[PDB]
Amino acid sequence: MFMINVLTLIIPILLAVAFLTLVERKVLGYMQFRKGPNVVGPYGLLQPIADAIKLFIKEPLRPATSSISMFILAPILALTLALTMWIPLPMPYPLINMNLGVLFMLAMSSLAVYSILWSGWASNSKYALIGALRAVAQTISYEVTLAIILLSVLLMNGSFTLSTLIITQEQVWLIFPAWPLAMMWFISTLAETNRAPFDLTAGPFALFFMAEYANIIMMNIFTTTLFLGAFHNPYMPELYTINFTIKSLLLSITFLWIRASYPRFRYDQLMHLLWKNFLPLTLALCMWHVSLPILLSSIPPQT
Amino acid sequence: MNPIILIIILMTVMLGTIIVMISTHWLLIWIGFEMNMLAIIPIMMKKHNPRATEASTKYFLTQSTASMLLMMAIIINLMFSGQWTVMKLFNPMASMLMTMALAMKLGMAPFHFWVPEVTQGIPLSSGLILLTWQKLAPMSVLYQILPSINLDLILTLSILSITIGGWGGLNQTQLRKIMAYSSIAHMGWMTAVLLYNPTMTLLNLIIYIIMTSTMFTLFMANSTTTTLSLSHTWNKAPIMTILVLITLLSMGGLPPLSGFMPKWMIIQEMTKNDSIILPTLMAITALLNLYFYMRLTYSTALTMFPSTNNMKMKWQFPTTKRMTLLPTMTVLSTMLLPLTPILSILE
Amino acid sequence: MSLVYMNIMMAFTVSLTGLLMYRSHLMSSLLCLEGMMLSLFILATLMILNSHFTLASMMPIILLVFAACEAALGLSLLVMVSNTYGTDYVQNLNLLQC
Amino acid sequence: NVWAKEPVLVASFAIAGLAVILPTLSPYTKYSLMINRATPYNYPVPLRDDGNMPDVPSHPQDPQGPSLEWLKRL
Amino acid sequence: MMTYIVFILSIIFVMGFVGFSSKPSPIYGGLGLIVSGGVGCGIVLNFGGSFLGLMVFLIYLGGMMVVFGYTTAMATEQYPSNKVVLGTFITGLLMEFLMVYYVLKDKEVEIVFKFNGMGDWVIYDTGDSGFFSEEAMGIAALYSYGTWLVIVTGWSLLIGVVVIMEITRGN
Amino acid sequence: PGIVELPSLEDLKVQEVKVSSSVLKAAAHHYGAQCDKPNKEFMLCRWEEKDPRRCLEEGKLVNQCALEFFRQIKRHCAEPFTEYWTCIDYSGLQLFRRCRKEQAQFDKCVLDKLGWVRPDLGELSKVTKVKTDRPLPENPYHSRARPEPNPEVEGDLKPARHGSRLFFWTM
Amino acid sequence: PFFDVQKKLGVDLDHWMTIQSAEQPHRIPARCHAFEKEWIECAHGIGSIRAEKECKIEFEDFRECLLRQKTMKRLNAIKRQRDKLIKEGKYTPPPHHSG
Amino acid sequence: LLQAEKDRRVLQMLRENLEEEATIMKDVPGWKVGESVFHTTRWVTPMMGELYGLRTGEEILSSTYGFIWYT
Amino acid sequence: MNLMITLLTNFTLATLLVTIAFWLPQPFSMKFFLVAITFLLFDLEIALLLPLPWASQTTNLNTMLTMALLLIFLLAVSLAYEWTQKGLEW
Amino acid sequence: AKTLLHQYWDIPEGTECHRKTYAATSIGGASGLVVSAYSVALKTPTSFLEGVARTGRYTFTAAAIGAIFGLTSCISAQVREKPDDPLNYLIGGCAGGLTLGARTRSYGIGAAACAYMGLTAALVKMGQLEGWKVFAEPKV
């Protein structure tokens, strides 16, 4: 039954990613003045089915490789991260209840940094190597920030079990005692998913594409667990799963919606902005969220 | 280089060495050795020539692998009877690995291959500070953990370091290599009497540090690399010559002079045991490492090499180097002969 | 004797011989130093866990962070050597002869 | 002044300084330490009965021992 | 899939140390140290291992091999296996095969020790009332008792920062 | 050397309270109220002698006290005690804030029909005296005597006897 | 040399990371607590040489608590004997779960 | 109550396991049947091979390594 | 080994996806390096910080506040030092 | 190592012969392997056949010196029938030095090696005869 649980987690990820491709194309089309894709059947779900199976059909990139084994070894790592990163995420009952899951989140984000760096070295000549090197730099510069902010928002709750998080979100949303910290965290999720307004300007393109969008849905689900949501009365998990899905969908639409209308940043502006504006502000919020639970007589019941 | 940054780096060298002196935990000793390395790396490469860069590379590799083998010895110590008290160890194997780690830390005969190479391509200040604190820092640790060491380790490294610093040493006119081979021979001496009475080891450490400070201060008074430059220092000034005479003869250790006092007390409290052939072998090699001192003195102050003009030009400028503290260290280092019962000032 | 300790000590000797004999690149030597570091980490951590040595359980993480910043210094030194030369071989260092 | 020059730095220094100072003027830190002390992890170990001591109460209902009452009353 | 899984993951661990101690190109070396760190994480989590083995994973497999592969990418080229590398890999596999064969079909293997040869379900806790996962409260010290230790650690890292900038052209 | 002194199978037969875990967890506080008065005898035996195979009569005593308590709660109100613990059973790890209204119902049953006020927080704490019948043991760490004392060097010190007593530099 | 400012200033800042049985932040013991307490009380007012030649029995007891070498040797001998006699076939074993 | 059941269960394994040992080792010379290796007359906590020894795999793996990788 | 079962199933299904996708159709700058080492050193200081929510339940609270503020203060001093001293400029 | 030097000195000297020469050849093979290991570490022969040749030459010469030392040791001890003198091992050290000079094929090195090896061998037997401890008391 446990392998049935694993397959019921990792079978709908292909459905979710392909339908996310049609949803991002349609939503960008209606932020723009475009209808479609809707000639390919009714509103185009067979359109992601069709282009996915087309890219499977289409003849691969000829090598042109260096260590064929290494070249296959990078995207296999990217996709197995994208699969193995929905294990401790609680919608009401997670797959594995852990003592700690958030450090596992940050560690697998660093393994995604490994995926980028290995594909960049094993790819090609020197210019793509320089481009992927800048990409690894602008990816690695934010795991300071996101881990710092995630630490300061769990410090209100003391424990790492994350079912204690779904307990402690019962009264108010956690956006209210930490709005700027959550806002900076959301900007860091835009950084980790490596999308607009942040620049990145391969093979297999579908697998790197899959890792991208599963990373996005991963960060959205972790956001929806982490900062908002509602209660969970037991012996009825459909209620929390509905409210969780609706809030995560609204947040992912907001994510692509923020992507839709902003130009890409200059690179030295990106590093300058991150260090000299997020890093003292994260330290300020950390020291205040340390010194405040010792003030207000509320240190969490870390069992 | 900023002077604030140099004061900070000196503060961290002093902090690391004082942490090695003062702590009772093994992790803190390892932290002190590592921080001593990390701080002493940018004292070298004080200029930007590639000589200092390769010297710092060799030094970093040997120093880091010594540090990690020391950590291996400590984790063996807690694989056996486990507590973090600087005391008698609980394994001959762990003590073997630990004394070989410290033998890499401070100048020993199988491990001395980095010492002349690290001293040749660096300026004088970096060589002075590395010899002083990198031969002071492990001696406290060995003074601590002496009661659980197989003696053949320490005695083999001491004998072989004295004879290597002897025999290697007859061939170099690079003065940094001369002082480095002298450091190897004296560290063999200062390690030899560790298991009999360590008061002699620490007094020999004091005398050696003061002697090397006098010698390197005399070289910093007028920048030389070879003996011919010392003959030009004979031409330009006479008092530096008699200082080179007295300090080289006190490195030689003659009984009218204060460098003999560390040899003689070693021979005393070594021969109150049943060790006689080992003292006469060590003191024959102490006669051996005086020969390059003596040919250096013959090159400097007693015979005279032909000189070059523009020394005529340098006559019109009186000396304007600052010495850190040369004369106090000199007469503390050389006229200390009737103060032998300042032996017991130490323990 | 908790048999796994034999294998981790043999792994330490593996990493130590890999640190000592090394042919061409200094980066392999530094990475085997890091492997030796990991070996000491794991060995001491299993010892402290099975001892229930619960007061001073700081040794794994603090040994880790110190020898990690050692590896950082080694990276900077290797970058400086590779900056003033073309490559970072063990060769092209035979200047400053002993 | 520097409020126009580098403003997010000045705001960071301000919240930093109040985070430094503000635990000094605080009527709740002793409450924090009493809450943190009054939570037991191990077993509350008993003792050999009495040298006829007017402490260490025999029934756990007896309020002669030190208890908590500011917990229930906020 | 059975009892000696700690021993088997240790076999793969020492194989990984051999696999980059044979001196390949240093990006293969970084791959070997990543695989070795993952299975070392597996070993220490088998001893449980609740925090420290997931803690190393962010540092070495999260922050150190990243910069090692970075410096492999930016400094050395190694632009094209060899006899010596794979021959040392063969001899390392032979030495491990010999040692584990003599562990299996005999009593004990002695370098100079007595390694009591069987898989380690011994020793372990006899089901105590842990209740806080003793690693967790142990490392949840260092801020009450740990006055000196964290101070000298942070001070060493600060001095590491100023050292790195000086060698890489301070100021 | 010395062999252990195990108890027999005649003392290893107590009517074991073969009940399940969630009912035992939900039935904890009033079991701390009415019973658990004569088991601090067992606790003090366990902490004055670190030796089970000795304190087992008091283990049989707490076993029969808990069985008597569950007999007494079995015979009277409530039978919806069964409803209360099955309300708290399937809720993962058993938080006591889960089924609170039926906790109030069981409290009102046992209060209006039997007594047994629930122990308010924090009264399952607050270090408690206990008297026993057995006298308290001495030196359970069965060791030898402390072998030798060092003779403490005291007395007002004389000056030096004829100086250093080295070769020369007398006085 | 080893100095004693650690004792001189009266700040015992480094004696708590040192042994077991110093007070943990929650009052829990180690696995070999009492063996340590009796060993330290055996070798306290002692010049570390009659510690070598007098407290040997309790030190060996503490060492075999810490590593459990020969106890595992006895258990391993029992395992090998059990394997060879079940290889023989005498008393198809009722030491597991039943008679 | 849990403490009393735990003590009776570990003494039950001690009694049955030393009965098994007394049945099984009557061939070797020497071998007192129930010696602690230690010297002091104190109940040491056993080592999970004195408790869960020769149980053949299943219960010792579900007992020692249970919580370590149970979820 | 339960999460090892999950890891095994994800790894095997990912390898099935890749291999069935494959059998079917047939110089440098110092500025690149400073940011990585700055990441490394501040990440190690994060590693020193992060057991803070473990620790907040003890009988020594003022000291914990003081040393926690000392750790973030030292991290801020390092940040402001490389900020003012042209460590991250272009 | 201590085991084989103990096997050499455990023989009464005295005559229990040709075990003395076998132990002396073992000493020579060990010392030749030591010095040849340092030399092959510090030369890089290129080719490796030259390295094997140099190690074989060093081991062969040191084993030859040990063998000839043991042979004339045994012969002088049997002939003179006075096992207490160091003069027999003075003859031994001079014979070993002469054959060292023979295997390096120069004669002045053989003469100086005769003198120094004879003096050292007489001192070794003489110190074993009186009793001078290895490296230490280490007491006071």
From Swiss-Prot, chain A:
It is found in: Mitochondrion inner membrane. It comes from the Eukaryota. GO terms for molecular function: NADH dehydrogenase (ubiquinone) activity. It holds the Pfam family NADHdh. The chain crosses the membrane at residues 2-22, 68-88, 100-120, 147-167, 172-192, 202-222, 238-258, 279-299. Keywords: Electron transport, Membrane, Mitochondrion, Mitochondrion inner membrane, NAD, Respiratory chain, Translocase, Transmembrane, Transmembrane helix, Transport, Ubiquinone. It catalyses: a ubiquinone + NADH + 5 H(+)(in) = a ubiquinol + NAD(+) + 4 H(+)(out). It is a multi-pass membrane protein. It is an enzyme of class 7 (translocase). The keyword NAD applies. Its EC number is 7.1.1.2. One of its GO terms (cellular component) is respiratory chain complex I. One of its GO terms (biological process) is mitochondrial electron transport, NADH to ubiquinone. InterPro entries: NADH_UbQ_OxRdtase_su1/FPO, NADH_UbQ_OxRdtase_su1_CS. Belongs to the complex I subunit 1 family. HAMAP family: NDH1_NuoH. Core subunit of the mitochondrial membrane respiratory chain NADH dehydrogenase (Complex I) that is believed to belong to the minimal assembly required for catalysis. Complex I functions in the transfer of electrons from NADH to the respiratory chain. The immediate electron acceptor for the enzyme is believed to be ubiquinone. This is NADH-ubiquinone oxidoreductase chain 1. It comes from Ovis aries. The gene is MT-ND1.
UniProtKB/Swiss-Prot annotation, chain B:
One of its GO terms (biological process) is mitochondrial respiratory chain complex I assembly. Core subunit of the mitochondrial membrane respiratory chain NADH dehydrogenase (Complex I) which catalyzes electron transfer from NADH through the respiratory chain, using ubiquinone as an electron acceptor. Essential for the catalytic activity and assembly of complex I. It is an enzyme of class 7 (translocase). The chain crosses the membrane at residues 3-23, 25-45, 67-87, 96-116, 122-142, 145-165, 178-198, 200-220, 237-257, 274-294, 325-345. Belongs to the complex I subunit 2 family. It is found in: Mitochondrion inner membrane. PANTHER family: NADH-UBIQUINONE OXIDOREDUCTASE CHAIN 2 (PTHR46552:SF1). It comes from Ovis aries (Sheep). The lineage of its organism: Eukaryota, Metazoa, Chordata, Craniata, Vertebrata. Keywords: Electron transport, Membrane, Mitochondrion, Mitochondrion inner membrane, NAD, Respiratory chain, Translocase, Transmembrane, Transmembrane helix, Transport, Ubiquinone. GO terms for cellular component: mitochondrial inner membrane; respiratory chain complex I. It is a multi-pass membrane protein. GO terms for molecular function: NADH dehydrogenase (ubiquinone) activity. Disulfide bonds: none annotated. It comes from the Eukaryota. It catalyses: a ubiquinone + NADH + 5 H(+)(in) = a ubiquinol + NAD(+) + 4 H(+)(out). This is NADH-ubiquinone oxidoreductase chain 2. Core subunit of respiratory chain NADH dehydrogenase (Complex I) which is composed of 45 different subunits. Interacts with TMEM242. Its EC number is 7.1.1.2.
From Swiss-Prot, chain C:
It is found in: Mitochondrion inner membrane. The chain crosses the membrane at residues 1-21, 29-49, 61-81. It catalyses: a ubiquinone + NADH + 5 H(+)(in) = a ubiquinol + NAD(+) + 4 H(+)(out). GO terms for molecular function: NADH dehydrogenase (ubiquinone) activity. It is a multi-pass membrane protein. GO terms for cellular component: mitochondrial inner membrane; respiratory chain complex I. It comes from the Eukaryota. It is an enzyme of class 7 (translocase). Keywords: Electron transport, Membrane, Mitochondrion, Mitochondrion inner membrane, NAD, Respiratory chain, Translocase, Transmembrane, Transmembrane helix, Transport, Ubiquinone. GO terms for biological process: ATP synthesis coupled electron transport. Its EC number is 7.1.1.2. InterPro entries: NADH_UbQ_OxRdtase_chain4L/K, NUOK/Mnh_C1-like. Core subunit of respiratory chain NADH dehydrogenase (Complex I) which is composed of 45 different subunits. Core subunit of the mitochondrial membrane respiratory chain NADH dehydrogenase (Complex I) which catalyzes electron transfer from NADH through the respiratory chain, using ubiquinone as an electron acceptor. Part of the enzyme membrane arm which is embedded in the lipid bilayer and involved in proton translocation. Belongs to the complex I subunit 4L family. This is NADH-ubiquinone oxidoreductase chain 4L.
Swiss-Prot record, chain E:
It is a multi-pass membrane protein. The chain crosses the membrane at residues 1-21, 25-45, 47-67, 84-104, 145-165. GO terms for cellular component: mitochondrial inner membrane; respiratory chain complex I. GO terms for molecular function: NADH dehydrogenase (ubiquinone) activity. One of its GO terms (biological process) is mitochondrial respiratory chain complex I assembly. Its main location: mitochondrion. It holds the Pfam family Oxidored_q3. It catalyses: a ubiquinone + NADH + 5 H(+)(in) = a ubiquinol + NAD(+) + 4 H(+)(out). Its EC number is 7.1.1.2. The keyword Signal does not apply. It is found in: Mitochondrion inner membrane. Keywords: Electron transport, Membrane, Mitochondrion, Mitochondrion inner membrane, NAD, Respiratory chain, Translocase, Transmembrane, Transmembrane helix, Transport, Ubiquinone. Core subunit of respiratory chain NADH dehydrogenase (Complex I) which is composed of 45 different subunits. Belongs to the complex I subunit 6 family. Core subunit of the mitochondrial membrane respiratory chain NADH dehydrogenase (Complex I) which catalyzes electron transfer from NADH through the respiratory chain, using ubiquinone as an electron acceptor. Essential for the catalytic activity and assembly of complex I. PANTHER family: NADH UBIQUINONE OXIDOREDUCTASE SUBUNIT ND6, NADH-UBIQUINONE OXIDOREDUCTASE CHAIN 6. This is NADH-ubiquinone oxidoreductase chain 6. It comes from Ovis aries (Sheep). The gene is MT-ND6.
